[PDB]
Amino acid sequence: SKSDVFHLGLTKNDLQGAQLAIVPGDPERVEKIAALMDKPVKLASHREFTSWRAELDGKAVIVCSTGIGGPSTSIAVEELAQLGIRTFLRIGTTGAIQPHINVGDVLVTTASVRLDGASLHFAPMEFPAVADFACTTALVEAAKSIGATTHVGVTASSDTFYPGQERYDTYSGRVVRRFKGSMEEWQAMGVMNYEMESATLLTMCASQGLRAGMVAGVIVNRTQQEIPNAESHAVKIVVEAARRLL
Amino acid sequence: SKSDVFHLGLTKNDLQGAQLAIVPGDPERVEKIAALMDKPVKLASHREFTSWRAELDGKAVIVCSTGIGGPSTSIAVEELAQLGIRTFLRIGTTGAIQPHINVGDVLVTTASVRLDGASLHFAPMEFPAVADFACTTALVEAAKSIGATTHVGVTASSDTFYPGQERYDTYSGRVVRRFKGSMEEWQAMGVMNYEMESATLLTMCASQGLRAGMVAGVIVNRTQQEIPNESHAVKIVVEAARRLL
Amino acid sequence: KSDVFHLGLTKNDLQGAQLAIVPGDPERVEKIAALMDKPVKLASHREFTSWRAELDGKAVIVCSTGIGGPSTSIAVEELAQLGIRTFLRIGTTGAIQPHINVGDVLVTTASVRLDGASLHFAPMEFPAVADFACTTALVEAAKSIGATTHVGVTASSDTFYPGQERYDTYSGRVVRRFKGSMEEWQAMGVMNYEMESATLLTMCASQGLRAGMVAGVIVNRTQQEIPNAETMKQTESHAVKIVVEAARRLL
Amino acid sequence: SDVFHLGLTKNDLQGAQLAIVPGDPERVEKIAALMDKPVKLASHREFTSWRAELDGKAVIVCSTGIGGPSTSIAVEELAQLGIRTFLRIGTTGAIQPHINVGDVLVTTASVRLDGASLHFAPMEFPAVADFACTTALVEAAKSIGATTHVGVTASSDTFYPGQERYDTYSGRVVRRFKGSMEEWQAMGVMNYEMESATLLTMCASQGLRAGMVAGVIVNRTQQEIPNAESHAVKIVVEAARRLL
Amino acid sequence: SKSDVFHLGLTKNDLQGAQLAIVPGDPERVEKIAALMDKPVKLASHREFTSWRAELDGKAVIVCSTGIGGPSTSIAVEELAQLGIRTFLRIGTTGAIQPHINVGDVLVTTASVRLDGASLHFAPMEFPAVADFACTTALVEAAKSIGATTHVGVTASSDTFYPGQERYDTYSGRVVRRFKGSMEEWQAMGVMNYEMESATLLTMCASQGLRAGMVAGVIVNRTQQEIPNAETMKQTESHAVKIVVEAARRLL
Amino acid sequence: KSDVFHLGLTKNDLQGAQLAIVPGDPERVEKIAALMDKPVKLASHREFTSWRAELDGKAVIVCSTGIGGPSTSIAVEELAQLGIRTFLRIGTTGAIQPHINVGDVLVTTASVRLDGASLHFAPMEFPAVADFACTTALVEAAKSIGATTHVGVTASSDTFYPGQERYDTYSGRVVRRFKGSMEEWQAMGVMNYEMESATLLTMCASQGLRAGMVAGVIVNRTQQEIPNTESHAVKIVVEAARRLL
Ligand SMILES: Cc1c[nH]c(=O)[nH]c1=O
Ligand SMILES: Cc1c[nH]c(=O)[nH]c1=O
Ligand SMILES: Cc1c[nH]c(=O)[nH]c1=O
Ligand SMILES: Cc1c[nH]c(=O)[nH]c1=O
Numbered sequence A: 001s002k003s004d005v006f007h008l009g010l011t012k013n014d015l016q017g018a019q020l021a022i023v024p025g026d027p028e029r030v031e032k033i034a035a036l037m038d039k040p041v042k043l044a045s046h047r048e049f050t051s052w053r054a055e056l057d058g059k060a061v062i063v064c065s066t067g068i069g070g071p072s073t074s075i076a077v078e079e080l081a082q083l084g085i086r087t088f089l090r091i092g093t094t095g096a097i098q099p100h101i102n103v104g105d106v107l108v109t110t111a112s113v114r115l116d117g118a119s120l121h122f123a124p125m126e127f128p129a130v131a132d133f134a135c136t137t138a139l140v141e142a143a144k145s146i147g148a149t150t151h152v153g154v155t156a157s158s159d160t161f162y163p164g165q166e167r168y169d170t171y172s173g174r175v176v177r178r179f180k181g182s183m184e185e186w187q188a189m190g191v192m193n194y195e196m197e198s199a200t201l202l203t204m205c206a207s208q209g210l211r212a213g214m215v216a217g218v219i220v221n222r223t224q225q226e227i228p229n230a231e232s233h234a235v236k237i238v239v240e241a242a243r244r245l246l
Numbered sequence B: 001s002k003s004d005v006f007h008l009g010l011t012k013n014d015l016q017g018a019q020l021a022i023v024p025g026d027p028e029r030v031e032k033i034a035a036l037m038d039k040p041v042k043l044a045s046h047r048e049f050t051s052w053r054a055e056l057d058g059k060a061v062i063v064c065s066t067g068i069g070g071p072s073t074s075i076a077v078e079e080l081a082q083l084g085i086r087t088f089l090r091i092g093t094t095g096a097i098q099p100h101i102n103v104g105d106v107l108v109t110t111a112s113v114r115l116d117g118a119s120l121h122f123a124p125m126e127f128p129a130v131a132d133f134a135c136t137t138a139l140v141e142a143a144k145s146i147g148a149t150t151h152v153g154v155t156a157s158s159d160t161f162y163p164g165q166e167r168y169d170t171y172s173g174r175v176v177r178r179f180k181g182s183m184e185e186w187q188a189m190g191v192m193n194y195e196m197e198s199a200t201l202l203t204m205c206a207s208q209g210l211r212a213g214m215v216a217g218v219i220v221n222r223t224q225q226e227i228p229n230e231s232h233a234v235k236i237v238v239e240a241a242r243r244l245l
Numbered sequence C: 001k002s003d004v005f006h007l008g009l010t011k012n013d014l015q016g017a018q019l020a021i022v023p024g025d026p027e028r029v030e031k032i033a034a035l036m037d038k039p040v041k042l043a044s045h046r047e048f049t050s051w052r053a054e055l056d057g058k059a060v061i062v063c064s065t066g067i068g069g070p071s072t073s074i075a076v077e078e079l080a081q082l083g084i085r086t087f088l089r090i091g092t093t094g095a096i097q098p099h100i101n102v103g104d105v106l107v108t109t110a111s112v113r114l115d116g117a118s119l120h121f122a123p124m125e126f127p128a129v130a131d132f133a134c135t136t137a138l139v140e141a142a143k144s145i146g147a148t149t150h151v152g153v154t155a156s157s158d159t160f161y162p163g164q165e166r167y168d169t170y171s172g173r174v175v176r177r178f179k180g181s182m183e184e185w186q187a188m189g190v191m192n193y194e195m196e197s198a199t200l201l202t203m204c205a206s207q208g209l210r211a212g213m214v215a216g217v218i219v220n221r222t223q224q225e226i227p228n229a230e231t232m233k234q235t236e237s238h239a240v241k242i243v244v245e246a247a248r249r250l251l
Numbered sequence D: 001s002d003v004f005h006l007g008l009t010k011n012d013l014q015g016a017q018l019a020i021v022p023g024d025p026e027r028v029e030k031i032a033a034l035m036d037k038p039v040k041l042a043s044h045r046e047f048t049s050w051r052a053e054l055d056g057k058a059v060i061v062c063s064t065g066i067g068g069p070s071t072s073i074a075v076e077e078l079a080q081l082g083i084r085t086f087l088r089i090g091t092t093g094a095i096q097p098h099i100n101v102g103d104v105l106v107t108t109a110s111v112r113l114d115g116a117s118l119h120f121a122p123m124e125f126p127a128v129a130d131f132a133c134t135t136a137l138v139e140a141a142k143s144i145g146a147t148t149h150v151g152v153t154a155s156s157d158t159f160y161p162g163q164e165r166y167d168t169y170s171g172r173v174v175r176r177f178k179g180s181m182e183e184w185q186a187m188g189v190m191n192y193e194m195e196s197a198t199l200l201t202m203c204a205s206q207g208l209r210a211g212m213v214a215g216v217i218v219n220r221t222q223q224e225i226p227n228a229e230s231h232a233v234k235i236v237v238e239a240a241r242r243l244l
Numbered sequence E: 001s002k003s004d005v006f007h008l009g010l011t012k013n014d015l016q017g018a019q020l021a022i023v024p025g026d027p028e029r030v031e032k033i034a035a036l037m038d039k040p041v042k043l044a045s046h047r048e049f050t051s052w053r054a055e056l057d058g059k060a061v062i063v064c065s066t067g068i069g070g071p072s073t074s075i076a077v078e079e080l081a082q083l084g085i086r087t088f089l090r091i092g093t094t095g096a097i098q099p100h101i102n103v104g105d106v107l108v109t110t111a112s113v114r115l116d117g118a119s120l121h122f123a124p125m126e127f128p129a130v131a132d133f134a135c136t137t138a139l140v141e142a143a144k145s146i147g148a149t150t151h152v153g154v155t156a157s158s159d160t161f162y163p164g165q166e167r168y169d170t171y172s173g174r175v176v177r178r179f180k181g182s183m184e185e186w187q188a189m190g191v192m193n194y195e196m197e198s199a200t201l202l203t204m205c206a207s208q209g210l211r212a213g214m215v216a217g218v219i220v221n222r223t224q225q226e227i228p229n230a231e232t233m234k235q236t237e238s239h240a241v242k243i244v245v246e247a248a249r250r251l252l
Numbered sequence F: 001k002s003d004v005f006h007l008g009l010t011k012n013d014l015q016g017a018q019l020a021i022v023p024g025d026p027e028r029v030e031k032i033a034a035l036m037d038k039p040v041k042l043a044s045h046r047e048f049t050s051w052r053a054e055l056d057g058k059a060v061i062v063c064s065t066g067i068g069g070p071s072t073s074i075a076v077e078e079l080a081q082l083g084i085r086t087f088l089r090i091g092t093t094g095a096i097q098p099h100i101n102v103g104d105v106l107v108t109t110a111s112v113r114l115d116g117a118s119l120h121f122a123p124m125e126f127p128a129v130a131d132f133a134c135t136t137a138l139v140e141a142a143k144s145i146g147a148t149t150h151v152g153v154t155a156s157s158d159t160f161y162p163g164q165e166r167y168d169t170y171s172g173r174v175v176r177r178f179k180g181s182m183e184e185w186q187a188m189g190v191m192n193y194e195m196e197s198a199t200l201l202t203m204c205a206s207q208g209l210r211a212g213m214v215a216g217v218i219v220n221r222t223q224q225e226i227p228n229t230e231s232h233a234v235k236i237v238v239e240a241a242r243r244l245l
């Protein structure tokens, strides 16, 4: 049963005809998401790529972690595509950069500011990191049905957690010129949030005939602090959206 | 004679509370679009900017031409915004670059490849030239209501009609390095079409808290020919406007 | 009948014309043509209004470009297809140097490429430079008319507002790229802002076409962000006389 | 747990100032076990961290995950906790015809085909390794007699198009990377990997020392996908000994 | 201080009120240019910067070598500007890229393709590497007066002699992607020629209120060969030198 | 007759030399040559003065580059054509770290590419990195004579003035790109400014040639803009050459 793909350790058989994947960043969240669906089965775990299969309305669905960042995301998406996935719904965590966005709010990304590198490996910068219309629609309509506080708009997608998101509470306390004042700039432009995979995901899918949607739960409000203290709606929405896209 | 803006020749009062504008490229289309709504009145014509007011479900609507290209578009949108317009629906013509997108088809742009310069005057290239979700939804729903062969997706928005759209039917018959082989590249990336205002419109709106939608009627298929030779799309943009008031 | 997609013109319409005067504003076309011999209207489609007239026995086209490089690129390309080899732009402009007064005439040697369309003809490193003969004719024409004239670099912007660092706008913001840009151009001795020359000059200089660029100063940005609507016409009259006189020297 | 991702405290490091940073979390324990007193510290996301002792000194082994972004998190958070020297041990695809599978490649500097490096320094800044770290790696390689090459590495944000792999879903490579492998080959670039540009750039621009070593798992002149290299691991540990 | 500037070894006094400098690349050409004017005298020589002073129309004129390339050019121009030079006329050698621009032809540059780095230290790439109108006019008129097959237009100004000018007869025989096919591109765009200082010179002057002109003698046609023939260089050089001096006369 | 267009040198002039020491200043060429056996003048053309000498029975070239990447690229290329495979630059430099003093010796591992010529050999993403053997030899040579030596990154600029953020100039202006740049490089641990290494290191590293870079500090920029290791750095480069033959 040699793997069809280099990193994921999966064969087409493992998908059982699945064409949709829910793709969290954290491998540890994969089982948790899969458990919200019928007949969840662990498939594989290699590096940051943990994969489970489950069933939604009688149809197989994949849950597969991407790890943090465009590079590992690009591997997961490519290899899932090779295996037969055609629709990707990213479920992530995010830092809000608008003052009235609450922790736990669900942010649906229409398109992303490409503060990444991997997107450029699929399309030049001019190309929009835009989500699929059907996927975005499914997410918004799912959000409506469950009644979660939801915001829809543009997301800044960064290759770093720290300087690219203009965090200063760091070892160096320095932010390179490019990102000095960048958060205020994005804020003024109505950008809702920061995360770290959507630019890559959306660009690589939109430029390769794959459908992608992007949703995230807010874990910190950056107008207040750089790092949240210790302590669902977005996940409920991503699963419900997947239902609509089968 | 009075105008609250430098180019359009319009006062805020002329808008009669309008918060939505339909923005075709061609000044000659303005009257045609206005005619589909109630109480159409000509407001002004200056340079490439012809404006009419009309009424849709008891609400004032502006129709104002942008002229061809990001620069004149940026002026029209900015000045309309100064006057109170918050939702912009572009209705254009377009060249399809996908083999199965036919002349007469209606194309709704989710976001644009920024092959323009004006978008960069509002946001750096990294920023997506993305349409407003509500506007795009309204356009897709309007397309269903009117009836059209409709495609939804990415559009290449060029500062030129010729080399930036890799046309060779030109004086020089050549295309700068940047654009050599570019059409086939966009085609491979699933880009539907070329037009000349959406990157500017979508970027300037998305980065300034304005809502923008983008729809165009296909007048040529570029896999077949370079030189082309809009009622469906106009009905759709008007129907979309009705949903966004 | 049209040989070209946008302009609605045929080679027959040019009557052997090899020079075009290209204002941004369609309304100015008739005005420019009125300074020449037996002007006649040819066509009006979108922002492209065209007239033909004569200057000492030679046919000359006057054709508007509309605002911005994109529509300019269409007009110039299609005129080139029709046989035009020399283009003189006559524009309006905002001066950014303190002692360039309203009504002054500015002749552009080359432009700061703050546009996108120029890039569709040549990479950024290529100069948006005017043709030597055209620039010479404009400078000489300025002396013939007797206008206060400055010759030098022009910033050619794809926007009227943020690219010219105007702040009295809907957003009241200017993107990082253009924050402080006006002061920078000022310090570099850039004379003025307008919106078509970068495209015009680049597309011509990279395609064997001759181009010149002249504009009348309708505002000085070191005293006003807003152009005075009533003083614009007389101010532009000098520059219009100059572009026509320059054309006379290039035939 | 106090650093946001790694879940580590300063105390967990017990004074460690050097970290060995593999890409794969599953390799962390394996590397730690080659040294004295290996102890698991934490595992969160792709970040598995162990402590060990080398010649009496505390050392950290911590995975970066694949790519600059996760690397940048691990390096930053380790630096917050006192790590000043980072030795990446990776896998790599060789692009020079005479560089064989099992060969050890020591990177002097990287071609920045990533995005995260730009979050620390503009492109003009060199993704250069620390001289002492590179020296230790080279001398460690010489000590065990491993077939070793020293030079430039192309560090890519993708495994596929950025390394001009065509055996993919789309079979497409974006214009930027079309013909890129041959160009790097002609420029004497030894190999592709996916973290060094970020690692080297972020360290070189922040007063941190970084070294980069990788074991060759495929030669790209032969095939795109590696057949499903303890020399490289031996070398990184021995190099670490010289850097304490 | 026996020098008011760091590299050139000159004081303001040495200029004797000169406001115009002729700036060849080759230190060896400095005396040759000076010798065509009145009261020529050596000033200084440090590194690639050899300076002479002469007189035209009773006005002092500097001749100062720049060395090859934008970097050394930027030093010479800056330090001369500090000393009071406001007008710079470069006289250079050049490779023609157009088929009908021939060895021995004289080329006057209106503006340059910025294939250099130093220009970017004065203005962003969007800014035109454009010559001064009065200077260009004087060079064109000068070329017409003394006799010369003259072309006026755009020049590609490269930081390298080899790959940036798409020369393949080199150690590596390779040309980086950016410059592969570049000569044909410039040719199609009507670019006349390659040289190595004008982008820096023109940009730094046009963006700092200084006047610059650029003239060069064609020593090779690149549609024919990569390396210039030695036989035709001396005559081409002296010919362009006569033109630059005549231009200077018109600008004083 | 010369085998190369600028240097005025033949392969025979080199007498089998495979290493060249490349100072910027033609006037320092003989001074470096005089530290080795049998120094003899080869040629002087433009900024390119070349001598040959002998080190441990092996021929060595000393050849000036002139200031800047452009002239450097000519000298390196033409020397490479004549058989040189190892290039050791010895220069002067302005220190930008407060902990570095005038007379200190700086060995460059890699350079910030603030030049243009490097781009003619490799795109910006490519590292302007020194050869490991050359760097090692320079470091070891430095340690052998006990000179105060720092090893690390160097900012290599196409200008002496604005690119090194000098304001004591005709214009007193520094273009936006370089505004605040010295502080930026300082914070990033960059040791110094000079004007040839980015070109040298990039062109060599991308063409299978070995390059090393060493410089003597003639000013510290935290103290002054304009300068007021002559022997130390020269002794080091010659001793390093010895180890690389
Ligand atoms: C808070 C936060 C979570 N996740 C991210 O990717 N970025 C952030 O800033
Ligand atoms: C046919 C066509 C119409 N409009 C455009 O903007 N581009 C095109 O190609
Ligand atoms: C005043 C003015 C006129 N025309 C322009 O293009 N820009 C300006 O600022
Ligand atoms: C084979 C291989 C392993 N790891 C990488 O990062 N790239 C490669 O090509």
Ligand SMILES: Cc1c[nH]c(=O)[nH]c1=O
Pocket (backbone or CB within 6 Å): E093, E094, E095, E161, E165, E194, E195, E196, E219, E220, E228
């Ligand atoms: C022939 C020639 C002379 N001078 C240059 O700068 N480049 C060339 O190609």
Ligand SMILES: Cc1c[nH]c(=O)[nH]c1=O
Pocket (backbone or CB within 6 Å): F092, F093, F094, F160, F164, F193, F194, F195, F218, F219, F227
């Ligand atoms: C002082 C100094 C020497 N050499 C340089 O190249 N730059 C400098 O600033």
